Amino acid sequence: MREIVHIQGGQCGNQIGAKFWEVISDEHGIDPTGTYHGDSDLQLERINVYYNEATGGRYVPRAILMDLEPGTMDSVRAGPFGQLFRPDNFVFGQTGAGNNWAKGHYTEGAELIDSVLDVVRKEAEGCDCLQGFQITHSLGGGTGSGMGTLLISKVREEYPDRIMETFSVVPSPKVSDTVVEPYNATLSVHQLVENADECMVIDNEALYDICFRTLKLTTPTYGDLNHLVSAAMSGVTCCLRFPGQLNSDLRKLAVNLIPFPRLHFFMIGFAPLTSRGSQQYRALTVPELTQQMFDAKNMMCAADPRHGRYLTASALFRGRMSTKEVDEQMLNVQNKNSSYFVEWIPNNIKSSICDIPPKGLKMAVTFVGNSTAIQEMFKRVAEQFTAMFRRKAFLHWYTGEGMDEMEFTEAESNMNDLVSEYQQYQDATA
Amino acid sequence: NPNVNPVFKLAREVPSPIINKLNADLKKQGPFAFRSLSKACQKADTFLNGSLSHDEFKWVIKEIGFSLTKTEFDNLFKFFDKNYEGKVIYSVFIDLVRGQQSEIITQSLSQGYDALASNNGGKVTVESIVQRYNPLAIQIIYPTRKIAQDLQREFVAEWGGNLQQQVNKNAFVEFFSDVRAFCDSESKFHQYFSNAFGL
Amino acid sequence: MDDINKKVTTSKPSNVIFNTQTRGYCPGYLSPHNQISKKGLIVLQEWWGMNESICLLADEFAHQGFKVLVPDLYRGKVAKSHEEAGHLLTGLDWKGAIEDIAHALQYLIKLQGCTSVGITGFCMGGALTLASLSAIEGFSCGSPFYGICDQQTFPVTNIRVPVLAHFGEDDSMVGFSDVESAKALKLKAHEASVDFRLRTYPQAGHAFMRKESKTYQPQAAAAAFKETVEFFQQLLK
Amino acid sequence: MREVISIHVGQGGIQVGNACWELFCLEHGIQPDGQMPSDGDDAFNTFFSETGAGKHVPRAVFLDLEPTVIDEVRTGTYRQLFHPEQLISGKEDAANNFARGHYTIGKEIVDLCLDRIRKLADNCTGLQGFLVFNSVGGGTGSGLGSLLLERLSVDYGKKSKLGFTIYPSPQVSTAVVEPYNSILSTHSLLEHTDVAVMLDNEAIYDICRRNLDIERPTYTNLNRLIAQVISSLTASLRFDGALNVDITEFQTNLVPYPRIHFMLSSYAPIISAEKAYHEQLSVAEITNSAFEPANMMAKCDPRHGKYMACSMMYRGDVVPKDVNASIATIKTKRTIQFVDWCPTGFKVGINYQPPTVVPGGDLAKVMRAVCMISNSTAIAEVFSRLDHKFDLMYAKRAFVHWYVGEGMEEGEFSEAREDLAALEKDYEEVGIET
Amino acid sequence: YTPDLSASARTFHKDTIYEKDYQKHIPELGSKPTVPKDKARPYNEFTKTYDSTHMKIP
Amino acid sequence: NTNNFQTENTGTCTSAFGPHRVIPYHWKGMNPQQKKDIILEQDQQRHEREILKNLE
Amino acid sequence: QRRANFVLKVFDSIDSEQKGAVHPFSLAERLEVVKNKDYQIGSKTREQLVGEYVAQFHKNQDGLITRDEFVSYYEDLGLGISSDQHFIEILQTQWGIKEDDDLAITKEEVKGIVKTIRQKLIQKTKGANDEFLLRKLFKEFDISNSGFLTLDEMNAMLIKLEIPIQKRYLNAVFSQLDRNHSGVIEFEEFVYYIVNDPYP
Ligand SMILES: Nc1nc2c(ncn2[C@@H]2O[C@H](COP(=O)(O)OP(=O)(O)OP(=O)(O)O)[C@@H](O)[C@H]2O)c(=O)[nH]1
Numbered sequence A: 001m002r003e004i005v006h007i008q009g010g011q012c013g014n015q016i017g018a019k020f021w022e023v024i025s026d027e028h029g030i031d032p033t034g035t036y037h038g039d040s041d042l043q044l045e046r047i048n049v050y051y052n053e054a055t056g057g058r059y060v061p062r063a064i065l066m067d068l069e070p071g072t073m074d075s076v077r078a079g080p081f082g083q084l085f086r087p088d089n090f091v092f093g094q095t096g097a098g099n100n101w102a103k104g105h106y107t108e109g110a111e112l113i114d115s116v117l118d119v120v121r122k123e124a125e126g127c128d129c130l131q132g133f134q135i136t137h138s139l140g141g142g143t144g145s146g147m148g149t150l151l152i153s154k155v156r157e158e159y160p161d162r163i164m165e166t167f168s169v170v171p172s173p174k175v176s177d178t179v180v181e182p183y184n185a186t187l188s189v190h191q192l193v194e195n196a197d198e199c200m201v202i203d204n205e206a207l208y209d210i211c212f213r214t215l216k217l218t219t220p221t222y223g224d225l226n227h228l229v230s231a232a233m234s235g236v237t238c239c240l241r242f243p244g245q246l247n248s249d250l251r252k253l254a255v256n257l258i259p260f261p262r263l264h265f266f267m268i269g270f271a272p273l274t275s276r277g278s279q280q281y282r283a284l285t286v287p288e289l290t291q292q293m294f295d296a297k298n299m300m301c302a303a304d305p306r307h308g309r310y311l312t313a314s315a316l317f318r319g320r321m322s323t324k325e326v327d328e329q330m331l332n333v334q335n336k337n338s339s340y341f342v343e344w345i346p347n348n349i350k351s352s353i354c355d356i357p358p359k360g361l362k363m364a365v366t367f368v369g370n371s372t373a374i375q376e377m378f379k380r381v382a383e384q385f386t387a388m389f390r391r392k393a394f395l396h397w398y399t400g401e402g403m404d405e406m407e408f409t410e411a412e413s414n415m416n417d418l419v420s421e422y423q424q425y426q427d428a429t430a
Numbered sequence B: 001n002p003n004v005n006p007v008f009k010l011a012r013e014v015p016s017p018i019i020n021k022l023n024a025d026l027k028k029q030g031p032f033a034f035r036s037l038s039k040a041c042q043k044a045d046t047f048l049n050g051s052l053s054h055d056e057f058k059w060v061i062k063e064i065g066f067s068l069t070k071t072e073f074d075n076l077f078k079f080f081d082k083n084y085e086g087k088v089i090y091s092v093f094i095d096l097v098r099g100q101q102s103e104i105i106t107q108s109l110s111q112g113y114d115a116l117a118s119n120n121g122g123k124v125t126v127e128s129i130v131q132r133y134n135p136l137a138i139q140i141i142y143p144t145r146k147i148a149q150d151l152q153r154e155f156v157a158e159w160g161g162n163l164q165q166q167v168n169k170n171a172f173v174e175f176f177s178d179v180r181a182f183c184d185s186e187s188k189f190h191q192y193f194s195n196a197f198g199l
Numbered sequence C: 001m002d003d004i005n006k007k008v009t010t011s012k013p014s015n016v017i018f019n020t021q022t023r024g025y026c027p028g029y030l031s032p033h034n035q036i037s038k039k040g041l042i043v044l045q046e047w048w049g050m051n052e053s054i055c056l057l058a059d060e061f062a063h064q065g066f067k068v069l070v071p072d073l074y075r076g077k078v079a080k081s082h083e084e085a086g087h088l089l090t091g092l093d094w095k096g097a098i099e100d101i102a103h104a105l106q107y108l109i110k111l112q113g114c115t116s117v118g119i120t121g122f123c124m125g126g127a128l129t130l131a132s133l134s135a136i137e138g139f140s141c142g143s144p145f146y147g148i149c150d151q152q153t154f155p156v157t158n159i160r161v162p163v164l165a166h167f168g169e170d171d172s173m174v175g176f177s178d179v180e181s182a183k184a185l186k187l188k189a190h191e192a193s194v195d196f197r198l199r200t201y202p203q204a205g206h207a208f209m210r211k212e213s214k215t216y217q218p219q220a221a222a223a224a225f226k227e228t229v230e231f232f233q234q235l236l237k
Numbered sequence D: 001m002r003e004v005i006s007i008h009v010g011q012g013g014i015q016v017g018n019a020c021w022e023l024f025c026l027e028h029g030i031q032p033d034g035q036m037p038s039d040g041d042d043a044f045n046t047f048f049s050e051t052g053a054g055k056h057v058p059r060a061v062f063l064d065l066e067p068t069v070i071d072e073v074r075t076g077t078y079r080q081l082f083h084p085e086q087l088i089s090g091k092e093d094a095a096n097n098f099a100r101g102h103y104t105i106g107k108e109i110v111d112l113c114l115d116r117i118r119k120l121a122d123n124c125t126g127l128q129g130f131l132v133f134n135s136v137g138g139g140t141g142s143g144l145g146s147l148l149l150e151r152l153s154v155d156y157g158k159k160s161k162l163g164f165t166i167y168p169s170p171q172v173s174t175a176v177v178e179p180y181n182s183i184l185s186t187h188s189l190l191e192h193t194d195v196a197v198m199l200d201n202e203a204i205y206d207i208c209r210r211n212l213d214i215e216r217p218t219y220t221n222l223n224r225l226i227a228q229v230i231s232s233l234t235a236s237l238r239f240d241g242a243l244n245v246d247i248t249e250f251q252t253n254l255v256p257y258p259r260i261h262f263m264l265s266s267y268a269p270i271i272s273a274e275k276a277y278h279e280q281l282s283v284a285e286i287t288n289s290a291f292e293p294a295n296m297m298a299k300c301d302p303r304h305g306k307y308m309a310c311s312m313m314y315r316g317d318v319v320p321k322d323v324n325a326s327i328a329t330i331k332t333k334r335t336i337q338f339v340d341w342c343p344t345g346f347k348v349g350i351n352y353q354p355p356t357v358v359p360g361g362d363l364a365k366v367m368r369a370v371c372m373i374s375n376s377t378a379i380a381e382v383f384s385r386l387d388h389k390f391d392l393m394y395a396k397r398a399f400v401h402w403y404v405g406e407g408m409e410e411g412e413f414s415e416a417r418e419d420l421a422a423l424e425k426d427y428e429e430v431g432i433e434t
Numbered sequence E: 001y002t003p004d005l006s007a008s009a010r011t012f013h014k015d016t017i018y019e020k021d022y023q024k025h026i027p028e029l030g031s032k033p034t035v036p037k038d039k040a041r042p043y044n045e046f047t048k049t050y051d052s053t054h055m056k057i058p
Numbered sequence F: 001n002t003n004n005f006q007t008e009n010t011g012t013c014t015s016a017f018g019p020h021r022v023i024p025y026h027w028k029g030m031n032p033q034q035k036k037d038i039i040l041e042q043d044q045q046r047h048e049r050e051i052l053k054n055l056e
Numbered sequence G: 001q002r003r004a005n006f007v008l009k010v011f012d013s014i015d016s017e018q019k020g021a022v023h024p025f026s027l028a029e030r031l032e033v034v035k036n037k038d039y040q041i042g043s044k045t046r047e048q049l050v051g052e053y054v055a056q057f058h059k060n061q062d063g064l065i066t067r068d069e070f071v072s073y074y075e076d077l078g079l080g081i082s083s084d085q086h087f088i089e090i091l092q093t094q095w096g097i098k099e100d101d102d103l104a105i106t107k108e109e110v111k112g113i114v115k116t117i118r119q120k121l122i123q124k125t126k127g128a129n130d131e132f133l134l135r136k137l138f139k140e141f142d143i144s145n146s147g148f149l150t151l152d153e154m155n156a157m158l159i160k161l162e163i164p165i166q167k168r169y170l171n172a173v174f175s176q177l178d179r180n181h182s183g184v185i186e187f188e189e190f191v192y193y194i195v196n197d198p199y200p
């Protein structure tokens, strides 16, 4: 019944996938041994969307884990909830990418993708009616950006009608730890816009920004950042798994957020977020949630949305409330900020309600917004690329596997055209 | 939400400060003030039913010497008469104003009842109590200037005039617990009890 | 929160009863696997009561060539947490339980058609196993697991069948399943001149046979299982 | 999973080999005799190979034409550890002559060494790369080291090779003929070594005196410092961490061009417990002290040139959020500037295992440490100084007759000099704005 | 007034075994090495490359 | 999960008329008990060699 | 001597009365308790039945096994076995006793230790120095000013100069330095050995 499969690649993708499955398992009451522990029958009504059925009454996720170095898969197995994953779904290489886009996309990626493509093909056939694919990878790494984008190309070729969603982490210039990240970032971006139906940008800078100031925890770790992404990842597909006053699936959001097929880069945010010593002090209400939803510093991208115009926006409310709080507030926020919304598409915001809140919360909101202010992070990345490319620095590694400079030239033009297209639609009047 | 408790109310709370003010004021009259409050309720309740009405409770408080205002009565009467029967059980009220008895003190009181009945053969009589006690022990619980000669009359004046009144162990244990409420130290009361009955 | 994965805390529906006359009918679980073997065996529950773990383990024994029956001592009550688990243990009556195993023996021998029957218990079940062997006639052998019953009420001198007991050094219980207590019991049995075998497994804690728990050790469980299965296979006829 | 083969040639290399392997055995819990005392798994396959009987054999081979140095290795407390026939020793030394160690007497020992490497290499199937240590200012060290790299280049090919060479000091040295065999070896390793590391003595001399407060250090103290540098670099292959870097991820992030592959290293914190237990030793403090040119292990001043790329490995209880904060401070600092075409040039690794302290050593037990590998245009300074060495030597053909008589062509000096001049011209060209 | 005592002045050494808090955490010289605890690179699926059957690729 | 083929049982490779003869096609290898004696003889030979050297 | 040290310990394990001779019954009983875990404490004809585990030895007129012959028999048995480890393991698994010295300090590591200490002094201050550095500490605590130095002082002395030597290693170097065997080492002789010695 319109289930989706999960594919995760790279070290960053594996850690996002490792913690994401913990949240879903807790939401549906699945223990680390794969046995149901819940209280209500609603938690089992739509279990087939994420978990397959196995013997003995245990469930296994339909997630494919891929990497070019098996050390990541050894770590993901020894973590909590590590016994749920089926051992056959691990497909790994014994060489590694070495933070090289060319190696992971032409030499090692090409020779290994035959095995993983067989696994994902097998998973898709098992379901009665597939709904789509979701991808979790980082665009700054070697195997995640390199082979991850090639699998998207192959999957799109054989499954045209299905929708594809990507939670992509791009590197920000502030917190930078890889010298060769501008090369493999822009190359993936050109490939991503060609095939991916939906792309969701995530920045480690923004995740650090939220932790230091909002949650006010002194020493955050990568587990904390992975938790924020996992909370947002589960929220977008909540109404497909639970009943509600208003239904909405992944396809419905895509229809109401993509006016033009080349404009499919969104930003996400999660509310509410409170410190430990401030939960006793804040009253949880819909006006409070909506106020934080459009807060600029609440986004998970380095792009500031007040520098552009919201082409479209969507909100997915989780919890029990009346439609008046929802409908009135979205109307109110559009009227008070009419300068931040483009004019030629009136009523450019979508609302959905799901009546199952998360554990420990009475209300929660996941926000997905399409804005032209996202073009500025592409400009900053392209700024660093052209600075390094004119001197042909770190190029002999990229030319060593047959890839030629014309693809480098092609990447610049397509990236610049995407940036220009965002600018054109922002500066338009009826 | 595990992080935050919802407090709120599911049961009517003890009013608090009006009871505390009564307890502090009662300590000023003397060691037998708590006896007077229990004595007043019993003597005002001439019919032995176990409850008092609206006006009767006003008289008992007024008889002791507390001129509580209308609001203070409303708060006190609200908790003790929960569903408005029109009557209030004085036995619960006296227990709360006195405080909490420590199990050690009550057990020592129970043995004191047995010890005083031992010499009499198991029968408790009021002559025995007024025959064997230490009037000079009044000083240790609180200093006083009254002579020991007048202390004997004060002890029996608080007691009944007749010397043939039957006593029960529950009536005996409630007698000394009332005196205990005057002193703030459980140890101080215990060492006074040993001096009085030679135990 | 207790580490309880619904396998030691959830009741397993029974399928077979039997009459004890004094207390009437009491329910029980009969393993559907491997009913062709004439060699019977009785499994006694731990302090929790019947759960999925004890029934699944009982099924594993039946796969090796035995007919396994699990009688009820709690009679429909299953512990849900550690706090009330002790309450049911104290509420249990040893005098009331002793005839239940005897009548289960009478049921297996007559209605099912068994020829020889053994007994096996775990923790308090092993404690009952030692008591059952002394005060009940008709058993062939018993395999208590880290369980010692009261001495004066049920002296071990009355044992008339070979006994094979399993204990670990790493026990933290005092006076119930201590390794030194096991050695003292073995010495008492040997001076009373009754066949008694004591087996000790290195680096094994309490309830080491229980699966899917913090106290599980797989290397010790397999060896003990093999030894007890071979011992039962050899001794039973 | 990751195996690396260690090569030691020359007196300097072997003595460094004693200190690094002593650290390696103690860090993994291996006793000197070679048996583990009775006590993710093992994690020692990187450096040791199990024989099936408990004994562990190091994955290294020792080479020298001088029998003397090998003897106390066999006569020392590590007699039982090393494989008896993997300690290759010759008959007569080169006696500070490159020609002797490359043409005349070095060819009768290379054939045994290649068989030993080949036999040891087939044991592992996930080899990462080779590590070579040699004293460049030595006869057999430069000669055999030069010839081995030539053979390994065609014998194995794409396997990465890292070299911790010992270039002669600027103003003081031991022998007189250092400039000759230094430049000759430089031309050999330029096109055959993937990564070269500067390990000059004067800078290491000054570090020990300034920080450890040792008035009379010796070669033993120097080798221990080099051992800690090697361990921190390799610590990511055998210990988990937040960020993992391997051997093949260094060249991808350190050498913009194949011709320029010379890096100078620094280590922090280097301190004794006298000044350490009085000190907080935070992650920000150690990072700041790492970039001071006075703390560099190469006698060079980075202030005179631009920075090409920077790689740092942290080990201990560091947290990524502070490392990012400390990095921004360096970028804010003005005295350190990067080349124009390098907007970002930092690669950071984090390991949970803190550095291990060796008994009888000088360093103190600390919870944080950083090792630096930096690529800079300032490295051209030391090469120019060696150029000034050779022109004064070669202007009147002094000492050359000791090289012609060994059969070496006289034109080797000319082509070596022109190769060095091109490299110096190359470095200044890469450090110009567009 | 005589000085307090010639044995109570400032002496650079005393008889107090560890004179400074300095020398209490210096690692013991002859001590045997210790194996590291559960802190190492994970090694569970690396086994199926060093088995002697990874060849025979077709 | 039980049985011999899945568990690589080592007790199934014994002959039916000899505790010392073995099934030619069913043999996992030598048990650690047999392996230990080889190491013991290797240890013995080292002391065995020194005795001859002393005589020489 | 290692075999002798082990065999004397094994004999003393059973000879709790220190008579020097052990009745045959206990020796035969021990050889069966370790072998079988189900033998029962007592047997019917246990004396004669278990006496076949013994009497490979010989007994005196009194009927006791003299300690001299018990050691002698294993000495005869210690000819067909040429591995010390094998011999120790055989006796250990035959008698259920495992207690031996871990190792004895060897001259190799003694030389290593004395080299470590000797180099550490050189680093401090200057070359003509460090002899007065060693002497001033002994002047500081040698109250009885007799010039005789003790083992406990050695540990204290080395603690001062940043060399925490292990007690076993300290005993070995202390024992190797002195030939008087009186437990007292002359200070000037120690200084001479540590400093003015041509050989390591
Ligand atoms: N860092 C360091 N360098 C050393 C050490 N020992 C020797 N060297 C260097 O080696 C150079 C001299 O060569 P040696 O190492 O003595 O011997 P060699 O390199 O094998 O050359 P030959 O003497 O001809 O055999 C000196 O200039 C030193 O720089 C050492 O222990 N540490």
Ligand SMILES: Nc1nc2c(ncn2[C@@H]2O[C@H](COP(=O)(O)OP(=O)(O)O)[C@@H](O)[C@H]2O)c(=O)[nH]1
Pocket (backbone or CB within 6 Å): A009, A010, A011, A012, A013, A015, A016, A097, A099, A138, A140, A141, A142, A143, A144, A145, A169, A177, A204, A207, A222, A223, A225, A226
């Ligand atoms: N948000 C997040 N980022 C991560 C995580 N793990 C690694 N990263 C980021 O990913 C970058 C390195 O990517 P890399 O591991 O080389 O990608 P890969 O080559 O595809 O595996 C680092 O800069 C980290 O900031 C994680 O768990 N969460």
Ligand SMILES: [Mg+2]
Pocket (backbone or CB within 6 Å): D010, D011, D066, D093, D138, D139, D140
């Ligand atoms: Mg030399």
